[PDB]
């Protein structure tokens, strides 16, 4: 699809077969999800943003579907105010910026 | 209301 | 152009006569540049993202050329970790996400 940028580019994602709204974010290296009790092994990570750093849990090889497109990779979980799909998954779904 | 979701991983 | 996302989408911009490198950031509502001088009146604002809130100077109706495309709009200046082009200017240069 084509997504204009008049509004926040929010799309539906599926992680654990369960559905969330997430922001397609070219300014994010990684994918960060709002706090959720995801099962699996994780490692601690600190990620940086506009205001400083936050601590998150890093889960690897997690299947995720983005607007119907299957992906699998690293997902970070922590106290982000919005679910964020970052470049690690945007590349897997063949997402580009065009102008 | 946060609005600028730059994110970087070391 | 069409820009893939395996690397950070950094482009050259010209603003107030000066060349800088900036990140095309669909996850930002606003454009925020690293500390610099700009001509004209500004107003104090705060913006937020991951890691919290920062204080910025808001300049209105500022011309900026982004990867060869002209925009004129709001530019925030403050302690951002990187120069960010947000949706307010991405829309002006006709940028969409595509997959």
Q: How far is Cα A32 from Cα A23, in angstroms, rounded to an integer?
A: 10
For this PDB entry, the determination method is: X-ray
* Inter-chain residue contact C49 with B8, CB threshold 8 Å: no
Return the partners of chain A (3 or more C-beta pairs < 8 Å): B, C
Whether the Cβ atoms of residue A73 and residue A30 lie closer than 8 Å to each other: no
The distance of C17 to chain A (nearest Cα, Å) reads 23
Q: Give the residue from chain A lying closest to B4, CA to CA.
A: A50
Return the DSSP state at C27. T
Q: Which two tokens stand for residue A41?
A: 């092994």
Please check whether residue C33 is in contact with residue C74, taking contact to mean a CB–CB distance below 8 angstroms: no
Alpha-carbon Rg for chain B in angstroms: 9
- Within a 13 Å sphere around the CA of B6, how many CA atoms are in the beta-carbon half? 30
Angle at A59 between CA A12 and CA A47, to 5 degrees: 85
Map residue C87 onto helix, strand or coil. helix
Q: What is the DSSP track for A44-97?
A: EEEEE-SS-EEEEEEEEEEEEEETTEEEEEEEEEES-SS-EE-HHHHTTTT-EE
Nearest-CA residue of chain B relative to A74?
A: B9
Question: Resolution (in Å) of the shown entry?
Answer: 1.8
CB C7 within 8 A of CB C52: no
Subunits in contact with chain C (3 or more CB pairs closer than 8 Å): A, B
Q: Which of C22, C24, C26, C29 is the mutation pick for testing B, counting most B CBs within 10 A?
A: C29
**B8 with A32: Cβ contact below 8 A:** no
A80 contact residues in C (CB cutoff 8 A): 50
Q: Which of A74, A72, A69, A75 is nearest to A36 (CA)?
A: A75
Distance CA A19, CA C35 (A): 40
Pick the CATH number of C1-99 from 2.40.70.10, 2.170.120.12, 3.40.190.10, 3.40.50.1220: 2.40.70.10
Structural contact between residues A76 and C5, judged by C-beta atoms closer than 8 angstroms: no
- Beta-carbon separation of A98 and C99 below 8 A: no
For testing the chain B interface, which of A31, A73, A81 should be mutated: the one with the most B CBs within 10 Å?
Answer: A81
Does residue C28 belong to the interface with chain A, where contact is any CB pair within 8 Å? yes
């Amino acid at each position: 699809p084509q997504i204009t940028l008049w509004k926040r580019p929010l799309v539906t994602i599926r992680i654990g077969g369960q559905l969330k709204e997430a922001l397609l974010n070219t300014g994010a290296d990684d994918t960060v999800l709002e706090e959720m009790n995801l099962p699996g092994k994780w490692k601690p990570k600190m990620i940086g943003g506009i205001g400083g750093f936050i601590k998150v849990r890093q889960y690897d090889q997690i299947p995720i579907e983005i607007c119907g497109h299957k992906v699998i990779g690293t997902v970070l979980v922590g106290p982000t105010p919005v679910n964020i799909i970052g470049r690690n998954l945007l590349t897997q779904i063949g997402c580009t910026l065009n102008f | 209301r946060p609005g600028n979701f730059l994110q970087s991983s070391p």
